[PDB]
Nucleic acid binder design. Sequence first.
RNA 1: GAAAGCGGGGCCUCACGAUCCUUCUGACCUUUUGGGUUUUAAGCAGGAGGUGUCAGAAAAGUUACCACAGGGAUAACUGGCU
RNA 2: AGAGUGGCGCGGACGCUACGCCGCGACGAGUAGGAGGGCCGCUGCGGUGAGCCUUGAAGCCUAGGGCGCGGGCCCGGGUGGA
RNA 3: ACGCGUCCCCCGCGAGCGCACGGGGUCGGCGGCGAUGUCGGCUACCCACCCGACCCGUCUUGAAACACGGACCAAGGAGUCUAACACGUGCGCGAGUCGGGGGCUACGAAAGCCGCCGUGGCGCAAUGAAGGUGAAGGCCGGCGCCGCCGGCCGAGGUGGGAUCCCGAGGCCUUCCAGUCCGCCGAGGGCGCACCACCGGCCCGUCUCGCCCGCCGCGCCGGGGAGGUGGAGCACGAGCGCACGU
RNA 4: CAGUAACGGCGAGUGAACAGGGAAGAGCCCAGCGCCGAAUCCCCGCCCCGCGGCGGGGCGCGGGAAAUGUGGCGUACGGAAGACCCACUCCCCGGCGCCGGGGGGCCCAAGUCCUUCUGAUCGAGGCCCAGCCCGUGGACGGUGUGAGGCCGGUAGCGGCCCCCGGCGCGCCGGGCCCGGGUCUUCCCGGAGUCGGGUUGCUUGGGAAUGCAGCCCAAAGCGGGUGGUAAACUCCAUCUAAGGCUAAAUACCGGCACGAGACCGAUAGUCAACAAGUACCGUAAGGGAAAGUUGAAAAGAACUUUGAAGAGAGAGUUCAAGAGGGCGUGAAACCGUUAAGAGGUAAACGGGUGGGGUCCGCGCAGUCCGCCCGGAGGAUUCAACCCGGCGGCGGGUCCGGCCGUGCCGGCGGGGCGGAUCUCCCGCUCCCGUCGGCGGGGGACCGCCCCCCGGCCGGCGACCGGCCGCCGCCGGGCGCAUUUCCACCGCG
Lengths: 210, 49, 147, 49
Amino acid sequence: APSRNGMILKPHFHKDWQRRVATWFNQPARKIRRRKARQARARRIAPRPAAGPIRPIVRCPTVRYHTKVRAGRGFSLEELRVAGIHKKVARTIGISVDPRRRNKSTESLQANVQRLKEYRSKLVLFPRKPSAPKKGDSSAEELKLATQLTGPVMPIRNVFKKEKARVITEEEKNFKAFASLRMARANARLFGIRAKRAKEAAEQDVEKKK
Amino acid sequence: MHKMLNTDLSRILKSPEIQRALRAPRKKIHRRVLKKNPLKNLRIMLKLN
Amino acid sequence: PSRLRKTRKLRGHVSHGHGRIGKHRKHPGGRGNAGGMHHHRINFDKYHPGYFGKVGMRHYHLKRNQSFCPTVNLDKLWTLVSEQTRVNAAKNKTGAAPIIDVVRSGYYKVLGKGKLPKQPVIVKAKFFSRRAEEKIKGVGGACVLVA
Amino acid sequence: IVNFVHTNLRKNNRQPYAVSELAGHQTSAESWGTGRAVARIPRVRGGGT
RNA sequence: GAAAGCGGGGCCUCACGAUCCUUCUGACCUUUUGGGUUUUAAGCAGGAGGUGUCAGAAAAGUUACCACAGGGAUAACUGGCU
RNA sequence: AGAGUGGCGCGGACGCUACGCCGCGACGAGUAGGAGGGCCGCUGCGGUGAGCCUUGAAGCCUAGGGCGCGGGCCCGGGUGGA
RNA sequence: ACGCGUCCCCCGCGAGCGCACGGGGUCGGCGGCGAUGUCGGCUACCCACCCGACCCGUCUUGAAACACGGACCAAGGAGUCUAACACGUGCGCGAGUCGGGGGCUACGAAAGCCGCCGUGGCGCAAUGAAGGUGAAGGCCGGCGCCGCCGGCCGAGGUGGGAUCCCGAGGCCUUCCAGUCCGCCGAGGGCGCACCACCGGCCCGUCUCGCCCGCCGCGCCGGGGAGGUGGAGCACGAGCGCACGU
RNA sequence: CAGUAACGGCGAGUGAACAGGGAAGAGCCCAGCGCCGAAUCCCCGCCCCGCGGCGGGGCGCGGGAAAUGUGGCGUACGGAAGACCCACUCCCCGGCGCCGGGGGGCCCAAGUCCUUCUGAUCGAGGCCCAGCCCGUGGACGGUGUGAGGCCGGUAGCGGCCCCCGGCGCGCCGGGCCCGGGUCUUCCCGGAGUCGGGUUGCUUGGGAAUGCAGCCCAAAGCGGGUGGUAAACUCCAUCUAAGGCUAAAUACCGGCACGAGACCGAUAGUCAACAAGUACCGUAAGGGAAAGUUGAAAAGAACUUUGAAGAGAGAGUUCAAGAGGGCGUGAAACCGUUAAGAGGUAAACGGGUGGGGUCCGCGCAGUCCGCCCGGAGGAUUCAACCCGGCGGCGGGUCCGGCCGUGCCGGCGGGGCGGAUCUCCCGCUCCCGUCGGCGGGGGACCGCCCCCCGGCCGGCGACCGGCCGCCGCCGGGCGCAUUUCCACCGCG
């Protein structure tokens, strides 16, 4: 029975909720497991990074997040082949592999051919046996000095190029900001109506001649 | 960062500025009256008129 | 706490604050929003006009990122920089103007509210409302668009 | 700001406790009804103990 | 009506009807989900189809085989006032 | 209870937990129901009492003695046994 | 009505003792009775007499009722946790605020830490069913009217409004000037919050009229005067924590 | 993301996904087109090894499966053959010795020292000038109370002795003849299924989100999807009708464990105990009540009344006022002693009187100063020098230390800013103009440290030499001073 002024409101407790209640009393020594069996992981994989195979330069979609950059799933099959690393050799040296990814612009394709040389250079690669190395395998001084990495490998931070303070020319100031947004809206919507009547008016001149 | 700067109000009350801007005290008490009926009592009646 | 509440001052009194005559009994009006066009009418129609009925068109699979339009007024349009692009720009002779990009501080459309601090300014913005054009031009500044 | 905090802080290293939901409702019971001259509470169903 | 005027129903006090859905009337109108041309739906405003239990559920009986919660706020007796 | 320029005896109650003391007037029914204050009770947890107990703890009993309007609490005696 | 020095119609500090109907009571007044049988003791145990006094809970206009439950005693026995909401009150920070998921390293399942862990939430912007639109103005010059050129101040009144500010005149110890330091003050000034009234600006809609703007010259875009719909502007108070209803 | 977009006698009411940021992270195999003399598999008789996961090698004119299709290369990220380039010694299947966790058990400091209360001590008081002794052990339990040092443990990258792995590295023994870049020519995929019409269930999905039946039932520039039915259209994005795969998640049953601001025998599980037991129902099923002598049994020899239970005296214990359903032992209700009283059922409120009980420790009556008279004690008071300490300002002695105080410096720095650009990474161009980055160098703010020049503080913050006046000790001072105790209707 509502008294007086006071917001109307709909609860969903009409089912038998109590029989399905979830609690997190676990919450503290469920963390302290992950962190343990986390701590197991990389003692198993000694000088390989615990940061694992490296994630590509990838955007966020739609008009909201399309200003941003983030880590992805895997490197496309025209970024691996151009650089000089094969798809089944790339798995065997910390470089990500995904069979689906696309190349639609060359502004996010040149950014992922350079990404793989940075890496290929700064890697340290051990010999098959300790007592007999070969050709591409690195020397026994780096390998002395070489050691594990912590946190994402070459992590992608948020970037923007700066600009100076400029004296404005006499045709920037003579450019409308609102009336050029309204004459691009007008001609996008009405172009379907435009073209059929430039056709039907030019149709009648053809008929009355012949 | 402090609300009031000197908590010492034993000493702020007795520095040159505060004791040259307050009126004087009234330390006398005035206890209640017993109305001696002046139709009866003499000098009570010589006080009125 | 269970000590500072009303129910201690009532161990001793009979009706416990729900009545001699008409008692606390289970559900007197009907449970929840009942009586919407019957016996709880008045109330509904005197603090919630317009609960009962249809209006407008229905859009189905509504993706809200397409509808995404943040906002930045004039009065405080200088709020996207440091305190270094404005004091040295006021010092000039040849008459320079710093480039405030609004896409860099999570702002899409530029709105036309208050005054302006009057010194030259180039203004990138995805959407210019008609007062954000005429305030910045009368003082003296460009209006470059972005996508 | 020590006290307010010290109460609301000392709650979080506390363990849960609970009294069971089986118990009480772990009989088949049922009221005898009006008549017989007994209180109307539910009573237990059939026996000789 | 010459002109002052007077007229937005009966000289004045009664002769009437909501959410929803169904109809018609209005415009070089909004929408029809990736973009566009044509059928097609959806809306915005203004009228009509009606609730007469008329602030507005969609609804017939019988129980002397009977049942529960209650009432002396309610009848079948005595007593009381008349 | 104003401030300037010239014509023998080393002495005098109490106070003011300012969240306390003190000071002069008018009033004081209450059922449903509101609200404050409780140095009114009953069990647990952090602090504190250089707390207390086999030279007698808790509980009970008591024509023994005291305390506040009141809820309740302080001490004499006998039991009891941690 | 009772010294004297001058103004007149009209003929500025004397000396002590003392008594009291005087801002709530004190005798610088007295007498008996005191050891195993008497002193005191309101309080708590038994008796007696005068006045008063029907049994409790309860529904009910009305209960001592010929309305119902109560033979006696112990021990148990009934507004509660959690999910919303709102108004008030304490506290931190304040155009901001908050790590709650995730991370890093006996009491501790606690506790300190991330900032390029604030993604995110609520808040700083409305309004339309939508496409969409989206928050002051004045006052003097270059050509009595447009379209554009410069320079200055700026979030607008009137009425009531806690306090401040300016101060005609005065605030005594013999007189006659002269001040500093304070306080008292006729009437007269800037008007903080809270309102009452008048103008304006943004969205929606309605009636009347003329000029603007153009890489695409239109069934294209933009400006102007008066009514009217709103949960709008108009120099911001929110956010996290806790308590109560 | 949202109590949203969507449903809903558009009423009650219900209700997602994608983007964003995290935990976890791993990716692959056939049918089919066709190349390689089925190159492939199963079972049996015989020896060598050998295994309580029947696997290793040799030898069978030994049987069988199979062209109605076995194995090898190979499956949309395309695959293959051939030609011409670039390179070529590491990849698994078991034994023999060599290099340090997971389960069992057996062991590791210090008072029962000196008095003292008790029935008994684990209690009370001491143990010096190493503040009894050990403390990586002051968790917990037991022991005739209440223990770090009396008994078990507690602590520690502590000690030993047995059982079974796990990584690394030799010696024999088994396999395996294998890899990438340019050019030419071949060649590519799941059917009664996709799809519709209708009928019924389902969903937030609206001219139908998913599922099923019955009917109709495909295509190869082909087929699904693109949240409002359809025709006529360009784009955008996945390959459906065969198959396998660890983690991040869930766990009121089971096997062991560790805790608790919980409950304490009408509680807490139905169950602290011969409980899913006594007992009830033909059967499905229903299902309790019930903890406590004492430190130790020292559980009461002998006598005496009685036929027997019941008793009287002896006796053990600190106690039977703890006597085998035995800790303390409340009320209701009984029985007996003292008192009291008693014809309007009792009981209750106001007010007094009588009697009891105890209790006052009641029975010759209050202290506290100063003053005056009359009897005495004790080596004693003022003052002056001798040391130590505070309270203070020396209105104008000397330094040092702060600062929510500033003004310098051609002083020796640590991070901050949406302020400006010489050395070089990488990349389009022909040693070269231009362009985006990886650091250094100027400039402005915010502060740490060091030298000079003004202001304020020593009351959340000092040291020395002075001057004062205050105490406290030491000398001197020898009484008409200084106080002690007592006596007077002062």
